[PDB]
Each structure stands twice: as structure tokens, then as C-alpha cells.
């Protein structure tokens, strides 16, 4: 029954992974003990995608929790829903990665990886028909970045015919001052380009700017940043968790969204944007929903969608609304904004509508775009990487772990190639 295995690695991966489970649990009527208490049958129809049914009619997330930082286990277990997670699915080390990709990928991470693979093997074999995997992690640290990409690679060896999907948090010096974050992110992107089928680019630069400029928060905290992350993750997974026709599984989503294998980095967006504690006085109209979710101020990646073209788009509308009005509005943005949509992929914008809205909203909309403007995110990381790399800055922290400088050169070149490929398709014409 199309099961997904969820994996959360590192401090960021576990923080956003926990919020994902707290949020989707509420939507499905599942309390922290695993009991169901809802009104709608749509809540449990596809509960199997993310939850295992344990004895006593309980539901337990098909989630594996990983971190080299031992202290992460306590913070996850102490969360509102820490009780729901399978105890044996918590795999924690004693020595962290110290913001070092090489430690997470090659040394401390490699020491712990077989313990994680044992637990993913067990969840995977228990599946009636496994779809693939979903990894939440950051790219700026050491565990989520290095060990997360090591896990992806090992999982790909045993399950090569399954979808590998990630929620990858991109670093921004606006939220983190760690000097080596561009190194860790470039090394991770190199891995993601080769080994994932679809990746959602949750950019800390866009999240900080949404909180500061749009939500008017003088100093956004990780809670503020993560409110946007969970709201995004709920929206982008709605099609997988509820009964529907379009993009109902990770494979059908990838066939619709990815025309060229490497070009699988999605720009997520949502509407209405809200802060924690902001009440909704009235529901947005379908034209407000459609206009806002396509707005650059609503994107979760710091890229201007009007600086590129949309290869493909998935629009998900949640709540009770007119489908005729939705269709009209979706045709309206494409006909009015025709120059930001590739003309050589006919009917590249697919729209789904789910009757169940998210918490505190009567109407909402989530956007998923595969845009050539995503090169703005990669160019920003590449520039930061190059500034340090030309000075051979901080390399001993990586080569001291056994790494070769040639790996940095290879990763830089691969990400720069990815950027040229987006530009090639942006300039392509339907001759």
C-alpha cells in the first residue's frame, strides 16, 4: 500500500522531522500515544503511507531518527510527540560531527551507518509495497549533510528501484555564522545531484527573509523558521497522504516534475504565509490563493521565479473551494505570465485539490516548481564556496578526516555544471 520510510538526520533534520510528525499527526487525528480521534474517514484512508498499524489499533510513524550528537535523542523524546516514535528506530552516536561533512560522511557517520541501515532494512521489508524514502536534513552542518548523504548512497545500493526524496535545508549566513557551511552544502549538493530523485530546497535565506520582511519578526528564531518548514512539508505531501488523482505517489510526482534526471531541485511555495500566533479572520479567495502561492515573497528558496522559466509545476489547493474557479485562476497565471513557462513542455502545470485544509486555515495552497531560476540558490552557494576554496581555507578539517582536495574540486565542478544545465533549458526554444 505505497509506504514511505522517513529518515531524519542531524540537529536540523530531527528538528524539522519532529515538527513534520507533530503537524501531519494532527491532520490525521493521531495523538502522541498513536490513537486515532477524528471526524473524517479521509484521515485514515491513506494513513498507511506514513504510519504502521501496531497491535491495539495504534499508529506508529515509519520514521528513523538519527544523530551523531547524543543529546538529540533527549530533545526528540521530550517533544510533544516523542512518545509516538518506535524506540528501536532511534539510532544515536556519542561523538557529534562538529559541523564537518567529512566526519559525518566518512568517519563518525560511517561508524554508525550500519546501525541505521539495519533499522531502515526492517521498516522497508515490513512494507507491502515500498514507494521510497524521505530524508529531512540540513546541508550546512556535519551529520545531516555528510551522514544524510552517506545514508542516501547506502540506501540506493539496496533499494535502487525506489524513489529517494529529500527535504534539504540550505544554509544562509543570515541564520548561521559557521564558516564552513558553503563547503558542507557543496559536498552535499554533489551527492544529491547524483543520488536523489527529487529534492525540496528549503532555503534558510528565504525563510529568514519571509520572517523578517513579510511576517515582521525583528529576530526570527528557529521556531519561526520551522513554522514555515512544517507548513511547507504538510502541503508538499498532501497528495501522498490523502485520496487523489494527481501526483499521488513519489514516482508519479517525479514523472510529472523531472524532465531531466539532474534537474530535480524543487522550489516550494505556500499561501497564505503566516506566523505562529497569527489568527485568520477570513479565508482567502481562489484568486488571492493563486496569486500569492506563485509570488516570489511566498517561495521557500531564495530565487526570483521571474529570473528563470518553469519546467514543471504542481499546485495543491486545500480546503473546500470551487474547482471551476481554481481551473480558471490556474489558466489565468499561465496565460498572463506565459514568458516564465517553458513552451516545449505542453501542459506542464498540474493542479490537485484536497478537501482537507491544514490547521487554522479554511483555504490554503502549496506550490512546487521545478524552475531554472533555482540556479540563483546554487550560484550563491558556489560563490561562497569559491571565496574560501581559492584560499584553501579550513581544508585541514576535511583532509584530516582522510578526504582528498580533489573531491572539493569535483563537487564544485558538478554544481557549476548543474547551473549551466538550468541555463541551457532556460534559453531553449520550441524552434
Amino acid at each position: 500500500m505505497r509506504e514511505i520510510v522517513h529518515i531524519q538526520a542531524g540537529q536540523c533534520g530531527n528538528q524539522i522531522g519532529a515538527k513534520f510528525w507533530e503537524v501531519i499527526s494532527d491532520e490525521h487525528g493521531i495523538d502522541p500515544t498513536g490513537s486515532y480521534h477524528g471526524d473524517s474517514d479521509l484521515q485514515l484512508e491513506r494513513i498507511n503511507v506514513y504510519y504502521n498499524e501496531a497491535t491495539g489499533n495504534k499508529y506508529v510513524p515509519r520514521a528513523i531518527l538519527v544523530d551523531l550528537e547524543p543529546g538529540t535523542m533527549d530533545s526528540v523524546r521530550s517533544g510533544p510527540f516523542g512518545q509516538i516514535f518506535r524506540p528501536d528506530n532511534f539510532v544515536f552516536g556519542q561523538s557529534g560531527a562538529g559541523n564537518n561533512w567529512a566526519k559525518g560522511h566518512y568517519t563518525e557517520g560511517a561508524e554508525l551507518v550500519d546501525s541505521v541501515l539495519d533499522v531502515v532494512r526492517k521498516e522497508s521489508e515490513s512494507c507491502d509495497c515500498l514507494q521510497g524514502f524521505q530524508l529531512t536534513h540540513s546541508l550546512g552542518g556535519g551529520t545531516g549533510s555528510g551522514m544524510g548523504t552517506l545514508l542516501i548512497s547506502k540506501i540506493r545500493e539496496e533499494y535502487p528501484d525506489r524513489i529517494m526524496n529529500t527535504f534539504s535545508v540550505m544554509p544562509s549566513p543570515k541564520v548561521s555564522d559557521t564558516v564552513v557551511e558553503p563547503y558542507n552544502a557543496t559536498l552535499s549538493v554533489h551527492q544529491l545531484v547524483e543520488n536523489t530523485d527529487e529534492t525540496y530546497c528549503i532555503d534558510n535565506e528565504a525563510l529568514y527573509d519571509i520572517c523578517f520582511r513579510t511576517l515582521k519578526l525583528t529576530t526570527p528564531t528557529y521556531g519561526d523558521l520551522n513554522h514555515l518548514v512544517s507548513a511547507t512539508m504538510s502541503g508538499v505531501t498532501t497528495c501522498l497522504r490523502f485520496p487523489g488523482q494527481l501526483n499521488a505517489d513519489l514516482r508519479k510526482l517525479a514523472v510529472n516534475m523531472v524532465p531531466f534526471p539532474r534537474l530535480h531541485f524543487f522550489m516550494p511555495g505556500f499561501a497564505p504565509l503566516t506566523s505562529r500566533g497569527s489568527q485568520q479572520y477570513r479565508a482567502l479567495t481562489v484568486p488571492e490563493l493563486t496569486q500569492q502561492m506563485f509570488d516570489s515573497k511566498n517561495m521557500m528558496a531564495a530565487c526570483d521565479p521571474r529570473h528563470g522559466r518553469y519546467l514543471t509545476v504542481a499546485a495543491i489547493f486545500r480546503g473546500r473551494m470551487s474547482m471551476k474557479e481554481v481551473d480558471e485562476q490556474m489558466l489565468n497565471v499561465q496565460n498572463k505570465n506565459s514568458s516564465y513557462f517553458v513552451e516545449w513542455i505542453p501542459n506542464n502545470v498540474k493542479t490537485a485539490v484536497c478537501d482537507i485544509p491544514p490547521r487554522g486555515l479554511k483555504m490554503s495552497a502549496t506550490f512546487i516548481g521545478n524552475s531554472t531560476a533555482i540556479q540563483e540558490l546554487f550560484k550563491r552557494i558556489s560563490e561562497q564556496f569559491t571565496a574560501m576554496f581559492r584560499r584553501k581555507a579550513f581544508l585541514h578539517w576535511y583532509t584530516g578526516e582522510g578526504m582528498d582536495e580533489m573531491e572539493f574540486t569535483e563537487a564544485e565542478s558538478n554544481m557549476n555544471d548543474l547551473v549551466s544545465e538550468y541555463q541551457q533549458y532556460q534559453d531553449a526554444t520550441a524552434d
Binding site: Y106, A110, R156, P160, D161, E401, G402
Partner: peptide, 27 residues
């Protein structure tokens, strides 16, 4: 196609063992 992908992934594994051995040479 799957065998080519596996060969590529297994070469990453040989490389990882080389990295681990290289660290050992230093300390």
C-alpha cells in the same frame, strides 16, 4: 542500467575505505 548504477555506488564504497585508511596514516 541497474548494474551500472550499482557499480558506480560500489566505487564510492571503495573510495570511502581509501579515505578511512588515509586518516589512519595521519592519526
Amino acid at each position: 542500467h541497474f548494474a551500472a548504477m550499482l557499480e558506480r555506488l560500489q566505487e564510492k564504497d571503495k573510495h570511502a575505505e581509501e579515505v578511512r585508511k588515509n586518516k589512519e596514516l595521519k592519526e
